[PDB]
Coordinates of C-alpha atoms in Angstrom, one line a residue:
Chain A
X2 CA 3.9 -33.4 -16.9
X3 CA 6.2 -30.6 -16.0
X4 CA 5.3 -28.1 -13.3
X5 CA 3.8 -24.7 -13.7
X6 CA 5.9 -21.6 -14.3
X7 CA 8.0 -20.2 -11.5
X8 CA 7.2 -17.0 -9.6
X9 CA 7.9 -13.6 -11.2
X10 CA 11.3 -12.3 -10.7
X11 CA 12.1 -9.4 -8.4
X12 CA 11.7 -5.7 -9.3
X13 CA 14.4 -4.1 -11.4
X14 CA 17.1 -1.8 -10.2
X15 CA 16.4 1.9 -9.5
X16 CA 16.5 4.3 -12.5
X17 CA 19.1 7.0 -13.0
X18 CA 19.2 10.4 -11.4
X19 CA 17.2 13.0 -13.1
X20 CA 18.5 15.9 -15.1
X21 CA 20.0 19.0 -13.4
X22 CA 17.6 21.6 -12.3
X23 CA 17.1 25.1 -13.9
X24 CA 19.4 28.0 -13.2
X25 CA 18.8 30.1 -10.2
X26 CA 17.3 33.6 -10.6
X27 CA 19.3 36.8 -11.3
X28 CA 21.6 38.1 -8.6
Chain N
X123 CA 10.4 -32.0 -14.1
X124 CA 10.2 -28.4 -12.9
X125 CA 8.2 -25.9 -15.0
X126 CA 9.6 -23.0 -16.9
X127 CA 11.0 -19.8 -15.4
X128 CA 8.5 -17.2 -14.3
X129 CA 8.1 -13.9 -15.9
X130 CA 10.4 -10.9 -15.2
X131 CA 9.7 -8.7 -12.3
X132 CA 8.3 -5.2 -12.7
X133 CA 10.4 -2.1 -13.3
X134 CA 12.4 -0.8 -10.5
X135 CA 11.6 2.4 -8.7
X136 CA 12.4 5.9 -10.2
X137 CA 15.8 7.2 -9.7
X138 CA 16.6 10.1 -7.3
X139 CA 16.1 13.8 -8.3
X140 CA 19.0 15.3 -10.3
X141 CA 21.6 17.7 -9.1
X142 CA 21.0 21.3 -8.5
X143 CA 20.9 23.7 -11.4
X144 CA 23.6 26.4 -12.0
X145 CA 23.7 29.8 -10.3
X146 CA 21.6 32.5 -11.9
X147 CA 22.9 35.5 -13.9
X148 CA 24.5 38.4 -12.1
Chain Z
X82 CA 7.4 -28.7 -9.2
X83 CA 7.2 -25.0 -10.3
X84 CA 10.0 -23.6 -12.3
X85 CA 12.6 -21.2 -11.2
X86 CA 12.0 -17.5 -10.6
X87 CA 11.9 -15.1 -13.5
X88 CA 14.7 -12.5 -14.0
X89 CA 14.7 -9.1 -12.4
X90 CA 12.7 -6.5 -14.1
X91 CA 14.0 -3.5 -16.1
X92 CA 15.5 -0.4 -14.5
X93 CA 13.1 2.3 -13.3
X94 CA 12.6 5.6 -14.9
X95 CA 14.9 8.6 -14.3
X96 CA 14.2 10.7 -11.3
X97 CA 12.8 14.2 -11.7
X98 CA 14.9 17.3 -12.3
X99 CA 17.0 18.6 -9.5
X100 CA 16.1 21.9 -7.7
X101 CA 16.9 25.3 -9.1
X102 CA 20.4 26.6 -8.6
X103 CA 21.2 29.5 -6.2
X104 CA 20.7 33.1 -7.2
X105 CA 23.5 34.8 -9.3
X106 CA 26.3 37.0 -8.1
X107 CA 26.0 40.6 -6.9

């Protein structure tokens, strides 16, 4: 009989940067 | 014979915060 | 023998929004 499944792979890569923040307040 | 490949790993970590927003109005 | 390792997981989620921008001009 073949062996059992291998171990899980490693975690994935990091996600992308988030969106830009909001505008600053009025001058 | 070896067994089958294991399952995928879990998702990676979140990305970094985004860039700063634009300047406010005058 | 156990099988080979699984593949890397999926990418993480996006990071959160960046900080507010600076105040507007005078």
